[PDB]
Write a protein that binds this ligand. Structure first.
Ligand SMILES: OC[C@@H]1COCCN1c1ncnc2[nH]ccc12
Ligand SMILES: [Cl-]
Length: 167
């Protein structure tokens, strides 16, 4: 039993809700929140910009030190950093950005990072400003993640379509 509330169950391990991931994290304080990161951990917009803003830019400061030490992530890769005031940890995961021409097959690799954590709060990878089809992203999530994932979808209209079209 966990403290996630109001989710629709899609499969044994995948749950979904129309919610602002920032507000969800602040309420639940999960062990792991997933950020929709880029390889430079530049948290300018989308989910990343919103999460970073909620940390008063502490996420960005920590991220800049991480990059200075380690260099950029790989598309499809991840790193674990602090969750600041939002969660114990933040798993920064880089899905392919279609508006950069990146290979959508890397979306499965991106979701595989979730399997290293027993329970996560997460957005749909490569959705929003990363330009992929969110219906496809949900399909890949369900077919790749085996640990317990709670998906927050900000847009109510998109949430209803993902549910109604879910196979
Ligand atoms: O689940 C990811 C969805 C779908 O594509 C990107 C937008 N999404 C968000 N969902 C929930 N909270 C959010 N805060 C900022 C963005 C955002
Ligand atoms: Cl977005």
């Amino acid at each position: 039993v966990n403290s996630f509330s109001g989710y629709l169950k899609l499969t044994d391990n995948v749950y979904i809700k129309n919610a602002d991931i920032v507000e969800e994290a602040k309420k639940v304080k999960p062990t792991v929140v997933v950020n929709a990161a880029n390889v430079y951990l530049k948290h300018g917009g989308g989910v990343a910009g919103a999460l970073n803003k909620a940390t008063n830019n502490a996420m960005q400061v920590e991220s800049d030190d991480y990059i200075a030490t380690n260099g950029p992530l790989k598309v499809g890769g991840s790193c674990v950093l602090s969750g600041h005031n939002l969660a114990k940890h933040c798993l920064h995961v880089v899905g392919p950005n279609v508006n950069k021409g990146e290979d959508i097959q890397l979306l499965k690799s991106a979701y595989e990072n979730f399997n290293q954590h027993e329970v996560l709060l997460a957005p749909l990878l490569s959705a929003g400003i990363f330009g992929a089809d969110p219906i496809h992203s949900l399909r890949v999530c369900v077919d790749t993640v085996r640990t317990n994932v709670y998906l927050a979808v900000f847009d109510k209209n998109l949430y209803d379509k993902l549910v109604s079209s879910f196979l």
